[model samples]
Target: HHHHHHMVHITLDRNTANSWLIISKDRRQVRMGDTHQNVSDNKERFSNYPMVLGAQRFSSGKMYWEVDVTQKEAWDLGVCRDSVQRKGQFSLSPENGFWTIWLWQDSYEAGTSPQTTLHIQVPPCQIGIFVDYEAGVVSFYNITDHGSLIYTFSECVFAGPLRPFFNVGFNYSGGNAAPLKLCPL
Candidate 1:
């Protein structure tokens, strides 16, 4: 069976961001907040995880979005269940409600049990995330390489709503100062 694909626009939800993460005024870009803010302890806020969720949620259908990594040295992007843990340190694997890919210090890895390393001839400046919820598939593509497949997660069972997830890493140093911008559709 064949499925149709299309683009979907996603904006960062500040309410779901960590205190140290900054969301652009327009809410389309996210980066490390220079200084941590004195925010209240909320279950929805990622107290230790430096990440944010998209404003929209998807339970079915084919969804696609792009994020510009550009000069960022360390970052993570993908989709996660709405109920994923937001407090403390936790594994970023599908078993923990996250199916994502991360880049750190010029190394690439997918968020899986035992985390798989990814090799690419060219670094991906912009990444395309495509999800087929009904088919239980989440795929990543290197937009800079004409949409070449970078990685894919299959047999994903979505028990609840799925939202686009992103993390610009912990600190502003180590080439991770750049923001992870959600591309315009």
Candidate 2:
């Protein structure tokens, strides 16, 4: 199977719940997943099933990602290996204004969350994230300001095949806003 780099960009709204984005990494195989889940291997508490980026496994190399978010309460955006056994919390927050970018490991089992300062606020706002995978870095940027980096991370990787999926839109647990304009570079 040929693995072609796949990029998905979308704008989510308040009306949107646990939705999904589908794409083809190789053009021949189509993969789909919910915005709120990772995979069946992850625990239900993490709601890790049907990952957002699809089912393709990602490893060492370079990748870029970004997203706009709106929140009515507190929430988080991060990367994890097993969603169940999250090893790290890279991104966490109150999420008031634009959030920093997040860099995920190649395995998707290690956990990462938003940093401090960026927390949850009202809904209907835009947030952008950018990632430099090869350099082992993840940075957050302000989309309003031509995507200014607000946060950054380094030396992150996974143990297994890193099949990343995005989570945005609405978090029933947090009862806050959701992510929108999620994409890759």
Candidate 3:
């Protein structure tokens, strides 16, 4: 279903960020921290998962946000249920409450029940996420290409509030040091 693009402001939820995930002071950007922080462990904090969730939760209606992944070799972005497990190593799949798309090793893949490989010759520098909770669809767009559809997760059943999720991946080398920024409207 095509609709007018509606931009939504989102910030990284530090509480949900992994110890090695560094969040900008404005909370609008995230990257892999050069050194791990000695932070207290909590149920909401991701241990093995190097990712973060948005501070805001959307229970209804449609919402969208764009993330700038320029210069990054690996990253993931999408929506996840508020209750998604965060204590251990878990697969980032829709069956596990996460509907995401990621770029790794020059390839793009949709994090579905059985992950699907995306046929994209070049990765998008900027990624857009559009979620229609009522329609049970979460779509990924290539913002650098006039919002071209990259992948869509259809027939999703949200059992609880859904929040925007992001990950810069586990690559800590300087090659993947660029920050994942949330673009402003």
Off by over 4 Å in 2: 1-56, 82-115, 118-124, 165-185
Of the two candidates 1 and 3, the one with more favorable lDDT, higher being better, is 1
Residues 82-141, candidate 1: write the lDDT tens digits.
Answer: 999998889899989999999977899999999999978889999999899899999999
lDDT of 2 by residue, 38-150 (tens): 32332222223222332333455544444444332332343333222322232332122111232222111112343333322222244443334455554444545554445
| Top lDDT hit | 1
Candidate no. 1 TM-score: 0.94
Q: Over the stretch 1-185, how does candidate 3's per-residue lDDT look in tens digits?
A: 24336678898999899998888899998988777866777788888867899999999998988889998888889999999998867888988899999988888899976889997755688888889989999998887777778998889988999999998887756688889999987
Query: TM-scores of the models, in the given order?
Result: 0.94, 0.44, 0.94
The TM-score of predicted model 2 comes to 0.44
Residue ranges of candidate 3 with Cα displaced over 4 Å: 1-5
RMSD of 3: 1.6
Model 3 scores worst on lDDT over the 10 consecutive residues at 1-10
